[PDB]
Amino acid sequence: GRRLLHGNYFTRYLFGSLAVIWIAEYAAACQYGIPRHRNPNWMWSWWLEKQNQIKNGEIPANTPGYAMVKWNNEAEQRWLKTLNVEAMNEEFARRREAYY
Amino acid sequence: FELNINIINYNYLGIIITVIISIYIYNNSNIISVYNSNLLLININIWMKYNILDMLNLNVLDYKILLWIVVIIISNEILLFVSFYWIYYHNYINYYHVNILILNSYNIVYNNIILLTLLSTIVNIKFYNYILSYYKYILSYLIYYNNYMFNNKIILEYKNNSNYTNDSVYMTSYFYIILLHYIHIYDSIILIVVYNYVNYKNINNYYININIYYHLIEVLYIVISILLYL
Amino acid sequence: NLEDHFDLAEYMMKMHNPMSEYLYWIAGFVSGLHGILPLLHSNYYFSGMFLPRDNDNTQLCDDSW
Amino acid sequence: SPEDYPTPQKYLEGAPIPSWYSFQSNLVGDMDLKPGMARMLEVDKRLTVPTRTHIRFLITGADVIHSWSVPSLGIKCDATPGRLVKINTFIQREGVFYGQCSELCGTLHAFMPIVVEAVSPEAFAAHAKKW
Amino acid sequence: YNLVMKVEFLFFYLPTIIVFGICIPVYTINFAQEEVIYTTMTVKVTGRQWYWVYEVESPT
Amino acid sequence: ESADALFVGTLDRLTAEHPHTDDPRFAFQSNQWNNCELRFTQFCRCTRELGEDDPRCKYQYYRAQTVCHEFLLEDWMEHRHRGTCDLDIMPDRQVIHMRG
Amino acid sequence: PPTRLSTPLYSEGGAFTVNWWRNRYGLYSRRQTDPMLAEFLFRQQVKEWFYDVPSYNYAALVGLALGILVAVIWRHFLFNPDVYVRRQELRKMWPDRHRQFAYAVPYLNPQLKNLLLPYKNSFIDNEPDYADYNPVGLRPQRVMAIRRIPGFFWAIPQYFFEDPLYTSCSTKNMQTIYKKLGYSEL
Amino acid sequence: FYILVNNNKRIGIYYIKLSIIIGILGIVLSYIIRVELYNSGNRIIKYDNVNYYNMVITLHGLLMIFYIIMPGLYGGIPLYILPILSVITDIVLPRINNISIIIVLISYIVVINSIVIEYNIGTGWTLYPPLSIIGTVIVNMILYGLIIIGISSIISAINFMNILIVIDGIIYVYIWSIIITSVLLIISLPILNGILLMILSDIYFNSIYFILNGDVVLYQHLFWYFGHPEVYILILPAFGIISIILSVLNNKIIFGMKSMILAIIMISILGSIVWAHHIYTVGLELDTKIYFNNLTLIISIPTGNKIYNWIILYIGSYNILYNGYQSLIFSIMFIIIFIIGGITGIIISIDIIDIGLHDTYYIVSHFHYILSIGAVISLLAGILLLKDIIGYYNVIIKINKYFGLLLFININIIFTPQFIIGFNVMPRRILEYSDNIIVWNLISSIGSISTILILLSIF
Amino acid sequence: DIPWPARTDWGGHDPATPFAELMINTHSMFWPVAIFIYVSAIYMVKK
Ligand SMILES: CCCCCCCCCCCCCCCCCC(=O)OC[C@H](COP(=O)([O-])OCC(O)COP(=O)([O-])OC[C@@H](COC(=O)CCCCCCCCCCCCCCCCC)OC(=O)CCCCCCCCCCCCCCCCC)OC(=O)CCCCCCCCCCCCCCCCC
Ligand SMILES: CCCCCCCCCCCCCCCCCC(=O)OC[C@H](COP(=O)([O-])OCC(O)COP(=O)([O-])OC[C@@H](COC(=O)CCCCCCCCCCCCCCCCC)OC(=O)CCCCCCCCCCCCCCCCC)OC(=O)CCCCCCCCCCCCCCCCC
Ligand SMILES: CCCCCCCCCCCCCCCCCC(=O)OC[C@H](COP(=O)([O-])OCC(O)COP(=O)([O-])OC[C@@H](COC(=O)CCCCCCCCCCCCCCCCC)OC(=O)CCCCCCCCCCCCCCCCC)OC(=O)CCCCCCCCCCCCCCCCC
Ligand SMILES: CCCCCCCCCCCCCCCCCC(=O)OC[C@H](COP(=O)([O-])OCC(O)COP(=O)([O-])OC[C@@H](COC(=O)CCCCCCCCCCCCCCCCC)OC(=O)CCCCCCCCCCCCCCCCC)OC(=O)CCCCCCCCCCCCCCCCC
Ligand code: HEA
Ligand code: HEA
Ligand SMILES: CCCCCCCC/C=C\CCCCCCCC(=O)OC[C@H](COP(=O)(O)OCCN)OC(=O)CCCCCCC/C=C/CCCCCCCC
Ligand SMILES: CCCCCCCC/C=C\CCCCCCCC(=O)O[C@H](COC(=O)CCCCCCC/C=C/CCCCCCCC)COP(=O)(O)OCCN
Ligand code: CUA
Ligand SMILES: [O-][O-]
Ligand SMILES: [Cu+2]
Ligand SMILES: [K+]
Ligand SMILES: [Mg+2]
């Protein structure tokens, strides 16, 4: 019975390596001054304004993004021919009444 | 007295195995390849027969030599996976913003981790019995059930996935890394199907090899799970 | 046996049949042909000539031969 | 917002936006060579650039890896698919600088030479306007 | 022994000093290649089998 | 009319006034592939807000041409016209957050 | 190095010592079958390898090379803008990756680049300062060095004030010559 | 029997015999090249058949490396003397030893058969995609050969590593060279297999790794991660032979044995982390280029120590002993030649110098001086040293000063001009060239025809 | 600009950019060191 490695080698070098990686990264961020706040959103300003309008109720709910742009590709032109937001909202309203 | 080593003078499996390999290149039908693979399996078994017959030499270094060979083979398997991880992470900058559906992190990862952990526990119990000079019949059939579920789950996942190898390098790497793991799971089936109780016990290289190999497959999946699913 | 002491005893004791050496040289000669024969075959296939005339793909003087 | 897409004030006032011109440079065949041309190095359309000007070369390869080499300008950049490599140069003297593809690329790797002619800025301006 | 050890020492560090002498020039020339320059003209070069395509900005 | 006005407002402005110079975000690397993709995405978003005819978006296309080879742009512009350009897909129709 | 097994070998405490090495040297050994033989073979290896003076030179080299190797690997992950490990920025289009762009400028101006760029005049003979000026401001304005690079640059004078032609070949003088002709702006 | 033999010494002979046979095809391919490059304009290859030339250079490079030099230095001599240098009787894994040589032959037959049957096109021995993955089936066949060759190399590496378990003597410097070479194969081969599979996937399984949005430079990293260790795997066994020859033929104990051993170990460690000096012109990051350039120069430090230790082995040897033996001359010639090749390697290690010299005949001359002269001469020197033990005859090579002098003069004529051509400049992998490079190319061509004639004199 | 017959051009020839001069000067800077390494070693190749 003779030991070759550290008595707790597996946990030592796994958690220990992870700890050193995490601490090194924080140090690197401080040196370069990188912002550390997390944003999960796209930063397109014009689009975010349109989304706020939908939330405020200025734009009808479930209105597609391609219904709001000044240039449409061919595929979007195909979809605009069959788009009826008013009908979609009524259908959702009917579902809510049935559920309740 | 006697010579330290009982020399092996002649061998003819090498020619047969090498010719079997060539048949793969020179085939004109994929049916020949299927039957050729059976020949390769047969002849490799004969080579394994020679290793068992070498026990008659009573050479203490034979166990050590084979054990270190397996260690080298294990390293090669690890480095092969490293290359796939290398390929996957090289194009990391092109992932997660392409119009493809990446895998969920809730269903597949959890059941596979649970399923493969049970496989490790079964093999661990086999090792414990091998230490105690004891056997339990049911253990082998638990492995077969475990392998059956793994095959059933992976087959459905590939068939129901809505993205294809040609869609993006991300999808190719996902499918390829998962296939490479499956092949190593299938190689485990090839090895475990012959598990039996041998009365010369702890001088049998097969037991230590199986324990090492099964552990390697399971740990590799943890790395895969972290890279792809989580 | 004394005859089996040395590996390749016939050759080492200088009694081997010369045909063994001829086959070795022939095998080497055949290996070399794998670079020359396909060269000739490919040249003819794409040009209709086994070998080019030097600088035949460039403009040549009237008296060039 | 419009300000999210910066544009120089001159163009917002109606100045014409520049356009880009593309041409193809091919080796001159052996049977089409003229008495003074250099075999294996001449091309049908050369690239004219102004001298004593900082120029940015962006080099890529469409199909396979080629390499754009002009030994006199000290440039050897691999034209790899998927990489738009950036090379900067400053030509000090007028002349015509010849080069060859420096990455095996197929049957005619040896038959896609590079010819760059550097002329005075006034000469280049007249040349650019005409072509 | 004393003399021999010095010879072995030189065999190792004389090549090391030469390497150090090259290192500083290597750093400098590498930085020169990647220096940010105020370029005023762009030429786009595309390699194709087997010819070169050049795209230039036409004057207004 | 400020010395540091280029940096102020956006990092984009730096190469808008000096089209043929390095962009601050990609100057560290010789490979400019990512620079071309950012420029093209900017052109796509300009048209959505302002429309193709707007001189601003016309110049944004010119900026893309400064760093994107024409064989790339022709292919990418074809995808944009059809409606399959992953860069120009409207945010509400993206699938990046789906199934993980 | 003692020659008698009776004389003990001095050992320090820690993870790399004589005692630490003895415990592990014979783990895989078939030749160390008894104490006397084991110690003899252990001291034979220690004498041959650790008491060899030139061997320590290679120990230094592997340390230096590995130290650089680990640092460069770590630096790329921590600071290189093009290297991504987190996924927040990769889930957005390029113009929206504001956090990643924060690495660009500082990663473009490492200390050593600033120190060594002024020494371009040790290589270029004509207009070594052709690229020194850049009004954009992504990098500092460069000023040519006043001394040659130490080492193998005996071709040029030790200091540039000793060269009678150094000032005549500067980008400023050449610009003066060509402007006088209307040849070019630079 | 002849094919069933497991004796390691017999198998060692088979490796040497097979390398010579395959060497003829490699020499033929090499001779085709220099004949074509005699002057501008087609000479033996039609302009409409330029594809054949690309195949000639591709096979010349592949055969010489994997099928000729590597089996000769890593399979031939080691299988003969390594179990003898160790106090053991035979190789540890006899049956594996038999199949390894058979595997090498079958892969050779596959390669040459592909020449005859498939359309002849080439992509270089480095098989850079996308060119390699848009080719015809000959590229598929060449991949099978490499993968098959990889199997033989790895199992042979496993065989040598097992000597550590059974060695009953001292680990001599030569044994260390083979062991460390095996270690390099074990760590580098699996990476090579992985990337080669990706090449097959694109060729045969509709994979898209090497099309737009897939970085082609990815292949170069993985390939050269094995590529450079390969060149060090070729040369390290040559270093072991030189150490034995110099010590034996001078009756001098090897000086600084441990320094020699540590130098070999150091080279392998450094050789595994400097692969990207093959990728200077692709446009890597500034810091990345500086790192590889700095570490590449460091490889000279251990390599230099070995050179000096060799020199002191020859210095001071007794004058009475005859010094004209071919084995001794070749061993001494190696030091002179290797220094030339290594110094030029350091020149092209500086990346800015490399910008001008990449893909030029300067690089060709660099690795020919090391491999075509140094490695061949080391292999020749080792075989000559073991002539009595091996027992071959019917050649005049043991004491032949004409052969040594003529070989040295003429090989230098072939490759010294190629350094000059590199600055002129002439690209590599090129059939036609400008008229003003003819003089130097003509001189090298005269050198090539002369060398072939000299080989006929040994018989 | 273009290759010329029977020219050594050791280290390069005919630079036209400041970077081209740098390439030639770098090779010339190291060339004498290379000679020193070769001469010093070769002089001692003897009995
Ligand atoms: C009033 C009755 C109430 C019954 C309640 C139900 C109980 C069922 C228990 C089933 C446990 C199966 C565990 C499988 C793992 C392997 C076990 C093992 O090692 O066996 C060794 C054992 C002996 O091996 P050995 O090598 O000879 O000896 C090794 C040791 O030395 C010595 O080994 P050992 O003796 O230590 O073994 C200990 C133990 C080790 O394992 C355990 O202890 C694990 C226990 C897990 C409990 C799982 C319960 C599942 C129930 C779910 C129900 C869900 C309902 C949902 C409703 C939804 C409504 C909307 O193993 C066993 O005892 C295995 C079961 C033996 C039965 C064999 C005969 C055939 C099956 C008979 C089933 C009868 C069911 C009647 C139901 C009546 C209800 C009123 O193996 C065998 O006997 C041979 C193979 C067969 C064994 C597996 C049989 C599976 C039967 C499943 C029945 C339940 C189905 C539920 C379906 C629900 C669908 C919705
Ligand atoms: C790099 C170059 C320069 C190198 C310089 C440096 C060199 C330094 C020295 C290196 C020395 C290394 C160590 C040497 C150790 C030697 C030990 C030794 O001798 O072992 C004994 C060993 C065997 O001796 P043994 O123990 O008496 O063996 C008895 C037999 O086992 C049993 O006796 P058996 O009579 O019963 O034998 C059976 C015999 C039965 O024999 C017969 O029945 C013979 C019948 C006559 C056939 C003759 C050939 C006919 C060809 C016709 C061609 C027609 C073409 C028509 C074209 C028409 C065009 C329009 O054969 C067979 O049944 C099977 C034969 C299979 C092998 C031969 C294959 C030939 C090529 C086939 C090509 C096929 C191509 C198909 C392609 C199709 C593609 C679609 O010796 C040999 O095998 C010969 C070795 C000779 C060399 C020794 C070394 C001398 C030093 C080197 C000299 C320079 C060589 C340069 C290379 C060659 C240049 C060309
Ligand atoms: C915070 C983290 C902290 C972590 C802490 C971790 C702590 C770990 C503790 C480890 C302790 C190890 C204890 C065992 C020592 C070795 C004993 C031994 O082997 O017994 C012989 C034993 C046989 O028993 P025996 O009968 O006693 O042998 C008698 C001798 O044969 C008869 O020979 P002799 O009597 O004439 O001479 C005796 C001796 C003569 O040799 C020696 O005594 C050598 C002594 C030095 C060994 C190295 C020690 C470490 C040095 C410091 C390195 C630090 C690097 C730091 C980097 C940091 C970067 C961040 O012979 C041997 O040692 C033969 C085996 C040599 C194998 C070498 C394989 C290549 C490895 C590279 C060489 C080492 C280079 C070091 C660096 C050099 C530059 C400064 O060997 C075997 O069982 C052979 C098995 C072969 C298996 C091969 C396949 C394995 C899988 C390969 C995968 C790929 C490997 C890649 C390697 C890459 C290399 C570059
Ligand atoms: C579930 C589904 C089930 C499905 C079921 C379906 C079943 C399917 C079955 C599939 C498997 C079929 C094959 C089974 C093999 C069985 C093996 C076995 O047990 O054998 C016992 C059997 C024992 O024989 P025996 O009945 O007691 O009689 C033996 C004699 O009495 C005396 O005993 P010996 O052993 O001394 O005599 C043998 C030897 C004795 O003769 C000699 O050795 C002659 C003396 C030597 C002369 C010098 C040769 C050159 C130096 C070579 C140095 C390296 C040697 C490496 C080691 C040998 C490698 C072969 O002669 C030969 O056998 C020929 C030797 C050939 C040497 C080749 C050396 C390199 C040639 C380079 C060529 C360069 C030109 C390039 C172009 C051409 C490329 C092909 O083995 C043998 O001795 C015969 C083996 C014959 C099979 C060889 C097959 C080779 C295939 C190569 C690939 C070809 C594909 C492409 C074609 C391209 C054509 C152009
Ligand atoms: C056996 C084969 C072999 C060996 C040993 C080497 C050894 C070395 N090689 Fe080589 N190399 C090749 C085979 C080999 N190479 C091949 C085949 C290619 C081309 C592949 C292809 O593109 O197809 C190549 C290409 C190649 C390139 C260019 C790659 C490219 O861009 O295409 C470079 C660049 O630095 C290089 C460097 C080196 C160095 C620095 C060494 C060092 O090991 C040399 C060190 C030795 C010395 C320096 C001399 C001895 C020491 C002294 C005398 C004292 C100390 C000296 C100094 C400090 C200067 N090699
Ligand atoms: C071991 C490897 C090896 C060897 C020996 C040689 C030997 C020779 N090579 Fe080379 N060569 C390469 C490996 C080798 N080569 C590689 C890897 C390339 C790059 C491939 C590519 O472009 O992709 C190359 C490229 C290459 C080119 C460039 C092709 C091109 O780019 O267009 C040329 C041109 O002349 C050339 C010529 C020669 C010549 C004239 C000889 C010889 O004639 C020199 C003198 C040698 C002899 C006269 C024969 C001596 C005998 C033997 C070598 C066999 C001995 C066998 C035993 C001892 C068992 N080689
Ligand atoms: C390869 C991707 C795999 C993703 C795996 C996900 C699971 C994470 C846990 C296991 C892996 C360890 C990494 C954990 C990182 C935790 C902190 C973190 O997020 O770090 C991110 C940060 C960078 O991310 P971005 O901010 O997007 O980039 C900024 C500009 N570059 O990552 C890092 O810097 C750490 C990544 C590297 C960690 C590993 C250690 C690095 C050094 C290796 C040296 C190797 C040489 C030999 C060493 C010898 C040591 C004895
Ligand atoms: C249970 C056993 C597990 C063992 C696992 C082993 C894993 C590693 C196996 C070897 C593979 C290494 C990974 C491959 C690394 C490639 C990195 C790479 O190519 O990156 C370079 C940059 O890389 C570097 O800077 C080079 C660092 C060198 C990495 C070497 C890692 C492997 C070294 C193995 C050497 C052998 C082992 C030595 C052990 C210690 C010896 C004392 C590319 O940079 P750019 O293209 O410019 O891109 C930068 C941003 N756009
Ligand atoms: Cu293009 Cu070569
Ligand atoms: O490869 O050097
Ligand atoms: Cu290399
Ligand atoms: K020609
Ligand atoms: Mg190249």
Side-chain angles (χ1 to χ4, degrees), chain D residues 65-67 101-106 108-110 112, chain E residues 48 50 52:
Chain D
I65 309 182
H66 314 263
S67 176
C101 180
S102 304
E103 183 79 298
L104 180 60
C105 56
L108 302 181
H109 163 68
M112 42 183 300
Chain E
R48 311 192 82 96
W50 293 268
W52 294 100

Side-chain angles (χ1 to χ4, degrees), chain B residues 102-117:
Chain B
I102 64 178
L103 280 295
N104 187 17
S105 56
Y106 285 85
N107 305 321
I108 295 170
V109 63
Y110 182 69
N111 56 38
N112 275 329
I113 292 293
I114 293 292
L115 182 66
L116 294 177
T117 302

Side-chain angles (χ1 to χ4, degrees), chain D residues 51-54 88-90 92-94 118-122, chain G residues 124 126-127 130-131 171 174-175 178 181-186:
Chain D
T51 199
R52 301 204 54 77
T53 300
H54 298 278
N88 297 345
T89 190
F90 180 90
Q92 287 175 317
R93 58 180 177 81
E94 298 175 7
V119 299
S120 59
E122 51 270 31
Chain G
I124 300 172
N126 300 278
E127 300 180 12
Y130 72 105
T171 312
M174 301 303 299
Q175 182 177 5
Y178 289 111
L181 297 173
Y183 186 78
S184 65
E185 306 299 346
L186 297 175

Side-chain angles (χ1 to χ4, degrees), chain F residues 54-95:
Chain F
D54 190 311
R56 282 185 176 273
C57 306
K58 295 285 186 58
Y59 187 79
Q60 296 304 295
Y61 186 75
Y62 168 81
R63 295 181 63 183
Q65 287 177 302
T66 308
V67 61
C68 303
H69 292 258
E70 205 66 39
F71 74 94
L72 294 169
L73 287 175
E74 295 294 348
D75 177 72
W76 295 1
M77 288 294 292
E78 173 271 4
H79 284 270
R80 190 183 82 98
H81 190 253
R82 301 189 312 182
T84 58
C85 182
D86 49 325
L87 305 176
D88 200 4
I89 296 171
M90 296 307 298
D92 62 338
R93 259 53 178 171
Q94 290 287 1
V95 300

Side-chain angles (χ1 to χ4, degrees), chain B residues 64 89 92 96-97 230, chain G residues 28 77 84-85 87 90 97:
Chain B
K64 184 180 179 186
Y89 183 77
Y92 197 79
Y96 307 118
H97 57 270
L230 311 181
Chain G
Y28 309 106
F77 279 114
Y84 293 78
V85 183
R87 296 162 180 173
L90 292 176
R97 300 175 181 180

Side-chain angles (χ1 to χ4, degrees), chain B residues 65-106:
Chain B
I65 291 162
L66 295 173
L67 175 58
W68 279 104
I69 289 169
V70 175
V71 173
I72 299 172
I73 295 172
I74 292 288
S75 65
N76 293 329
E77 295 178 355
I78 294 170
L79 293 178
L80 181 62
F81 272 89
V82 167
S83 59
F84 277 59
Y85 301 154
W86 187 342
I87 294 157
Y88 168 85
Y89 183 77
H90 185 93
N91 298 315
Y92 197 79
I93 187 172
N94 292 321
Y95 302 164
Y96 307 118
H97 57 270
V98 184
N99 55 320
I100 62 176
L101 302 177
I102 64 178
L103 280 295
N104 187 17
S105 56
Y106 285 85

Side-chain angles (χ1 to χ4, degrees), chain H residues 224 227-228 231-232 277-278 366:
Chain H
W224 285 120
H228 180 81
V231 306
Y232 288 109
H277 72 238
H278 291 278
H366 151 66

